[PDB]
RNA sequence: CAGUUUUAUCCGGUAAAGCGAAUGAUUAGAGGUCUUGGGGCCGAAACGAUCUCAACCUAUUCUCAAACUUUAAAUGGGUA
RNA sequence: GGGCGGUACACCUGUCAAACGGUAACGCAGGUGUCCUAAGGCGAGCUCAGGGAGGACAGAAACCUCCCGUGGAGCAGAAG
RNA sequence: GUCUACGGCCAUACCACCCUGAACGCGCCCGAUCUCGUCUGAUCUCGGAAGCUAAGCAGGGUCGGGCCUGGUUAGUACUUGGAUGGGAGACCGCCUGGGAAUACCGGGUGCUGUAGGCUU
């Protein structure tokens, strides 16, 4: 019968990385966070005010609220079978952006660039991502010499 | 004695070292881990015969006492009294447990410390003898006997090194000769081409 | 025979601090309060007002902050005074108030709020917290950022404060550390402050140094007397700072004659020369070795 | 040329009297320094209580003072006047400072008074070169540089150059 | 919509490994001045000289770790 | 098995936990039913343990002074 | 090339010993009437400007430590899935696919995304 504390089993988790102790650098704060952006959550042991509970360290959600020093956020969780949609209020230190949406926002623009162009040309340019196909037949030139014969080594006791 | 060693033979539990937590530990019997004329140079004991273990097991330190003695008494006879150097290359740190059934019974049966033991992997050195090159046919005979104290099965192997080093056989004299290695009693130090220059001048001059 | 404490195992476990703290010019615990904007403001910048004291110079700059390093809008040096006619005692409290005025109406002459929001024309010494004007574009504010100078009671920084405020900037302050504050009964005079502004405490040396001795009047007044400045010329300039020479606030940065682009710093000795030096030193040590003995 | 910012002057001169007892012994040993310099001294106190000496934690014991400028040369002349200019080798620290303690304050020229007694005290001289208050100012600290730092031999041929003080081996 | 996979992305401190790196445990020699002692020892004295056993400093060496860690996999966990 | 003996009968800290989270036994090593007008709330100013070299009685250890000094100190209690 | 305020994890930027430093600059330096403080005008605060290159300064140097990246160690250690595969058991081989880390040997030692005054 283990305990039900706030910070059970977080010896290594809220700890600072090696040789990165000390002062929180000042480009963590003055970044801007709108509503609708997608955010991952990483804990931190310096500023004890406004920590998340230990079961959110790694999850990723979106914003619904902005406060004076915090943003509200909507995440998902799995409790004994079902999935709950719960919302918290997290200070800024414990929070980063997620770059997962960005290669999509670079491919919406690239596709609409590849569509506005060459539609008036009557061209049919491929739009779907297609998985890595099986590779093509190709020649191999051995100019001159022969392949190098291998030999399995005879055993000797190394130790 | 105590309970025989059929009981505590297979590596089963997690390691339970003597520490801040496990006090109440009696001391091991083995206290000296090498013998002979250990005040040696690395230039007069070329030979180096190991005893490689084979099976994943536990070796008691009373075996690490009654093997050292049985290899010493034959080494004094054959090779002389100053013609060798014996090392024992284990140290018993693991601590094994016991339960006394003396009416309470089986409840609360966490054990008390009984003795000490040493873990052994496969292909791991236990004992090692370095000697002159003329005396090779009496170390197979000493270790053939030391094999009757340990359980299991292990093999006797003559190395391809020089002494208690990590260097090869022939390579050693051409490197000492070109002044890359320095003798330090039982060992040798390696000189790289990396450090600053004043040691170089303090080596050549 | 003691243990060397700067081992390899001292340099492995040694996280360095920040560069501006190693060069000790700054404070990050005093910045973090001053510089961040509240997150419900959404890219609304936070103006701060830097004041720097150097042993021969005064600097007054204005800057907000970004992630690319905090960015200047309007600078005001204290050696652009001898344009106007103050050449000596370049760093006293008087020029600390004259610079904050040159900054103030410089910025108002870069935004277009000159005639509106005048500020104080006379020099009195009392509180002139400038209130905003209805209908017109609102007032301007900027918070102070002194830094590493103990703001006790009587600092030259506050003279620049009173200058930019009376120029028209709206800076929050309270008259408790100004020259003229009674630390036993807590009242405040104006004329003691105006006796400290125009240069009368500087002037009084035209007695305590002009009478009692005459040898030290030349040991430490050797640039007033060279520029022919008497101790009664403690005089107004501010109509010259006011009128029209902020149409060159920047002095019109001067054009640049083409430079020869010559170098004054010996370049880095390369690899294939550091691999060659120790072959010289090993052959010189062996040809000065085997010859001798 | 000797780069006139390479002189050898006195930064400060220290003084203390440790009596190991509060009450009246301390407050009477506080009038020798006041007559001696002209300024008030500062009481020191204990650090951790020892059962054998007879001291308690944070109990006042000693009295010390610091002297500057042209005042230190005068008291130091009454010092080397007392010691007749025969200091020795091992009085000099490895960083460039010396010090020594007189046995009785009658040698400083102070007349005896029978409600005081005699209190033994200590001197300690601290040398200097221009730039030494770099390592203490608040704004831009920096350090010295170690071409500009004082050894033991330079100080001994300053003492021998200045006061003609001999140094004997021992 | 999915008890699944791919392409982008962040999270984690387990197996292994490592003490010539910290926190703890541990074997044997090598050079130094004594850094201090208990005794030889010549000594009206010594770090003079000492055999040193010994601890002390520096480079090396033999083995270890659930409540120790620089590094750090496999499977696996959210998002789009 | 009951009994005598214990509290795993409400709480927290490391470990078992098998690299998110969750997870048992009369499994381990440990603690609590309080204390404080400051040991709470702001602001200025300072930097610790240990170590060296010195200094009158002063010694293993009183105080002073100089240098090295990434936490080896401290933060009321158990441990992170 | 410098001064002001910075950015990023803040070391490719640190530490130790050397050396050259043009002009503008930064600084040690000259001092104590001015309600700034101290036992002490050293530190802090103010009023200054005769005089000069040590300076956390700036730049280069060390067959340097340190750090940052690359090979070796190694398809080794480990490992998801499976077998009427051995073996008395301990544990080890195979198919299937993933796959590390030290020692050791090499190269690098501040970019300045930065705005204002400035080798100009
Ligand atoms: Mg078990
Ligand atoms: Mg320097
Ligand atoms: Mg030099
Ligand atoms: Mg382990
Ligand atoms: Mg798991
Ligand atoms: Mg407390
Ligand atoms: Mg530059
Ligand atoms: Mg020219
Ligand atoms: Mg290096």
UniProtKB/Swiss-Prot annotation, chain A:
The keyword Ribosomal protein applies. One of its GO terms (biological process) is translation. It is found in: Cytoplasm, Cytosol; Cytoplasm; Endoplasmic reticulum. It holds the Pfam family Ribosomal_L21e. The keyword Nucleus does not apply. Residues 111-144 are annotated as: Disordered. Residues 111-122, 135-144 have a biased composition (Basic and acidic residues). GO terms for cellular component: cytosol; endoplasmic reticulum; ribonucleoprotein complex; ribosome. Keywords: Cytoplasm, Endoplasmic reticulum, Ribonucleoprotein, Ribosomal protein. GO terms for molecular function: structural constituent of ribosome. InterPro entries: Ribosomal_eL21 (IPR001147), Ribosomal_eL21_CS (IPR018259), Ribosomal_eL21_sf (IPR036948), Translation_prot_SH3-like_sf (IPR008991). It comes from the Eukaryota. Its main location: cytoplasm. Belongs to the eukaryotic ribosomal protein eL21 family. Component of the large ribosomal subunit. Component of the large ribosomal subunit. The ribosome is a large ribonucleoprotein complex responsible for the synthesis of proteins in the cell. This is Large ribosomal subunit protein eL21. The gene is RPL21.
UniProtKB/Swiss-Prot annotation, chain B:
Pfam families: Ribosomal_L16. GO terms for cellular component: cytosolic large ribosomal subunit. The keyword Lyase does not apply. Gene3D superfamilies: 3.30.60.300, Ribosomal protein L10e/L16. InterPro entries: Ribosomal_uL16, Ribosomal_uL16_CS_euk_arc, Ribosomal_uL16_dom, Ribosomal_uL16_euk_arch, Ribosomal_uL16_sf. Keywords: Citrullination, Cytoplasm, Developmental protein, Isopeptide bond, Ribonucleoprotein, Ribosomal protein, Ubl conjugation. The modification Citrulline is found at residue 31. There is a cross-link at residue 179 (Glycyl lysine isopeptide (Lys-Gly) (interchain with G-Cter in ubiquitin)). There is a cross-link at residue 166 (Glycyl lysine isopeptide (Lys-Gly) (interchain with G-Cter in SUMO2)). PANTHER family: 60S RIBOSOMAL PROTEIN L10. Belongs to the universal ribosomal protein uL16 family. Component of the large ribosomal subunit. Plays a role in the formation of actively translating ribosomes. May play a role in the embryonic brain development. This is Large ribosomal subunit protein uL16. The lineage of its organism: Eukaryota, Metazoa, Chordata, Craniata, Vertebrata.
Swiss-Prot record, chain C:
PANTHER family: LARGE RIBOSOMAL SUBUNIT PROTEIN UL18, RIBOSOMAL PROTEIN L5-RELATED. Component of the large ribosomal subunit (LSU). Part of the 5S RNP complex, which is a LSU subcomplex composed of the 5S RNA, RPL5 and RPL11. Component of a hexameric 5S RNP precursor complex, composed of 5S RNA, RRS1, RPF2/BXDC1, RPL5, RPL11 and HEATR3; this complex acts as a precursor for ribosome assembly. Interacts with isoform 1 of NVL in an ATP-dependent manner. Interacts with RRP1B. Interacts with IPO5, IPO7 and KPNB1; these interactions may be involved in RPL5 nuclear import for the assembly of ribosomal subunits. Transmembrane segments: none annotated. It is found in: Cytoplasm; Nucleus, Nucleolus. GO terms for molecular function: 5S rRNA binding; structural constituent of ribosome. The modification Phosphothreonine is found at residue 230. Residues 251-293 are annotated as: Disordered. Its main location: cytoplasm. This is Large ribosomal subunit protein uL18. One of its GO terms (biological process) is ribosomal large subunit assembly. InterPro entries: Rbsml_uL18_euk, Ribosomal_uL18_C_euk. Keywords: Acetylation, Cytoplasm, Isopeptide bond, Nucleus, Phosphoprotein, Ribonucleoprotein, Ribosomal protein, RNA-binding, rRNA-binding, Ubl conjugation. One of its GO terms (cellular component) is cytoplasm. Residues 256-266 have a biased composition (Basic residues). There is a cross-link at residue 218 (Glycyl lysine isopeptide (Lys-Gly) (interchain with G-Cter in SUMO2)). The modification Phosphoserine is found at residues 183, 270. There is a cross-link at residue 218 (Glycyl lysine isopeptide (Lys-Gly) (interchain with G-Cter in SUMO1)). The modification N6-acetyllysine is found at residues 3, 46, 218. The gene is RPL5. Belongs to the universal ribosomal protein uL18 family.
Curated annotation (Swiss-Prot), chain D:
PROSITE patterns: RIBOSOMAL_L5 (PS00358). GO terms for molecular function: rRNA binding; structural constituent of ribosome. The keyword DNA-binding does not apply. It comes from the Eukaryota. There is a cross-link at residues 31, 45, 147 (Glycyl lysine isopeptide (Lys-Gly) (interchain with G-Cter in SUMO2)). It is found in: Nucleus, Nucleolus; Cytoplasm. Coiled coil: none annotated. Its main location: nucleus. One of its GO terms (biological process) is translation. PANTHER family: 60S RIBOSOMAL PROTEIN L11-RELATED. Component of the large ribosomal subunit (LSU). Part of the 5S RNP complex, which is a LSU subcomplex composed of the 5S RNA, RPL5 and RPL11. Component of a hexameric 5S RNP precursor complex, composed of 5S RNA, RRS1, RPF2/BXDC1, RPL5, RPL11 and HEATR3; this complex acts as a precursor for ribosome assembly. Interacts with PML. Interacts with MDM2 (via its RanBP2-type zinc finger domain); negatively regulates MDM2-mediated TP53 ubiquitination and degradation. Interacts with NOP53; retains RPL11 into the nucleolus. NCBIfam families: PRK04219.1 (NF003258). Belongs to the universal ribosomal protein uL5 family. This is Large ribosomal subunit protein uL5. The gene is RPL11.
């Amino acid at each position: 019968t283990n305990t039900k504390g706030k910070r059970r089993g977080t010896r290594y988790m809220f700890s600072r990385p090696f040789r990165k102790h000390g002062v929180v650098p000042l480009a963590t704060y003055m970044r801007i966070y709108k509503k609708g952006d997608i955010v991952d959550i990483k804990g931190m042991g310096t500023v004890q005010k406004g920590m998340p509970h230990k079961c959110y360290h790694g999850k990723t959600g979106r914003v619904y609220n902005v406060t004076q020093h915090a943003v509200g956020i909507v995440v998902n969780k799995q409790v004994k079978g079902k999935i709950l949609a719960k919302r918290i209020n997290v200070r800024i230190e414990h929070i980063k952006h997620s770059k997962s949406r960005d290669s999509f926002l670079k491919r919406v623009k690239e596709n609409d660039q590849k569509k506005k162009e060459a539609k008036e040309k009557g061209t049919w340019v491929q739009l779907k991502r297609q998985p890595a196909p099986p590779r093509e037949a190709h020649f191999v030139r051995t100019n001159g010499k022969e392949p190098e014969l291998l030999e399995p080594i005879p055993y000797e006791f190394m130790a | 004695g105590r309970r025989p060693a059929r009981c505590y033979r297979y590596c089963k539990n997690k390691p339970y070292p003597k520490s801040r937590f496990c006090r109440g530990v009696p001391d091991a019997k083995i206290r000296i881990f090498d013998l002979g004329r250990k005040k040696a140079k690395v230039d007069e004991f070329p030979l180096c015969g190991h005893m490689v273990s084979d099976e994943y097991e536990q070796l008691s330190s009373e075996a690490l006492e009654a093997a050292r003695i049985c290899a010493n008494k034959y080494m004094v006879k054959s090779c002389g009294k100053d013609g060798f150097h014996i090392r024992v290359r284990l140290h018993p740190f693991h601590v094994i447990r016991i339960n006394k059934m003396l009416q309470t019974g089986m409840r609360g049966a966490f054990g008390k410390p009984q003795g000490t033991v040493a873990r052994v992997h496969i292909g791991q050195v236990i004992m090692s003898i370095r000697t002159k090159l003329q005396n090779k046919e009496h170390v197979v005979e000493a270790l053939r006997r030391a094999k009757f104290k340990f359980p299991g099965r292990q093999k006797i192997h003559i190395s391809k090194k020089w002494g208690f080093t990590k260097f090869n056989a022939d390579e050693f004299e051409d490197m000492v000769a070109e002044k890359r290695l320095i003798p330090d009693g039982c060992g040798v130090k390696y000189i790289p081409n990396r450090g600053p220059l004043d040691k170089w001048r303090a080596l050549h001059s | 025979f003691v243990k060397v404490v700067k081992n390899k195992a001292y340099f492995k476990r040694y996280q360095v601090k920040f560069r501006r703290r190693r060069e000790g010019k700054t404070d990050y615990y005093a910045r973090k309060r001053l510089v961040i904007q509240d997150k419900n403001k959404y890219n609304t910048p936070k103006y701060r007002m830097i004041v720097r004291v150097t042993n021969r110079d005064i600097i007054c700059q204005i800057a907000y902050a970004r992630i690319e390093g905090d960015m200047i809008v309007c600078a005001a040096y204290a050696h652009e005074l001898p344009k106007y006619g103050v050449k000596v005692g370049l760093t006293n409290y008087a020029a600390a108030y004259c610079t904050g005025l040159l900054l103030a109406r410089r910025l108002l002459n870069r935004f277009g709020m000159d005639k509106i929001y005048e500020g104080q024309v006379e020099v009195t010494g009392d509180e002139y917290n400038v209130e905003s004007i209805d209908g017109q574009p609102g007032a301007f504010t900027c918070y102070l950022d002194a830094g590493l100078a103990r703001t006790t009671t009587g600092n030259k920084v506050f003279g620049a404060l009173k200058g930019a405020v009376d120029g028209g900037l709206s800076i929050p302050h309270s008259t408790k550390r100004f020259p003229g504050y009674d630390s036993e009964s807590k009242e405040f005079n104006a004329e003691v402050h105006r006796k400290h502004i125009m240069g009368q405490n500087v002037a009084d040396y035209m007695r305590y140094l002009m009478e009692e001795d005459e040898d030290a009047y030349k040991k430490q007044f050797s640039q007033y007397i060279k520029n022919n400045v008497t101790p009664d010329m403690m005089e107004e300039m501010y109509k010259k700072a006011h009128a029209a020479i902020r149409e060159n606030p920047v002095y019109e940065k001067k054009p640049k004659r083409e430079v020869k682009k010559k170098r004054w710093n010996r370049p880095k000795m390369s690899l294939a020369q550091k691999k060659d030096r120790v072959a010289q030193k090993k052959a010189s040590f062996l040809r000065a070795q085997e010859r001798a003995a | 040329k000797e780069n006139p910012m390479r002189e050898l002057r006195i930064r400060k001169l220290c003084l203390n009297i440790c009596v190991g007892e509060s009450g009246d012994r301390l407050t009477r040993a506080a009038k020798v320094l006041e007559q001696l310099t002209g300024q008030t001294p500062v009481f020191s106190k204990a650090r951790y209580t020892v059962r054998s000496f007879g001291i308690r934690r944070n109990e006042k014991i000693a009295v010390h003072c610091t002297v500057r400028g042209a005042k230190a040369e005068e008291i130091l002349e009454k010092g080397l006047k007392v010691r007749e200019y025969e200091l020795r080798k091992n009085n000099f620290s490895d960083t460039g400072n010396f010090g020594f303690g007189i046995q009785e304050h009658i040698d400083l020229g102070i007349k005896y008074d029978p409600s005081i007694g005699i209190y033994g005290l200590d001197f300690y001289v601290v040398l200097g070169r221009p730039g030494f208050s770099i390592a203490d100012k608040k704004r831009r600290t920096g350090c010295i540089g170690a071409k500009h730092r004082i050894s033991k031999e330079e100080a001994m041929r300053w003492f021998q150059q200045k006061y003609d003080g001999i140094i004997l081996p021992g």
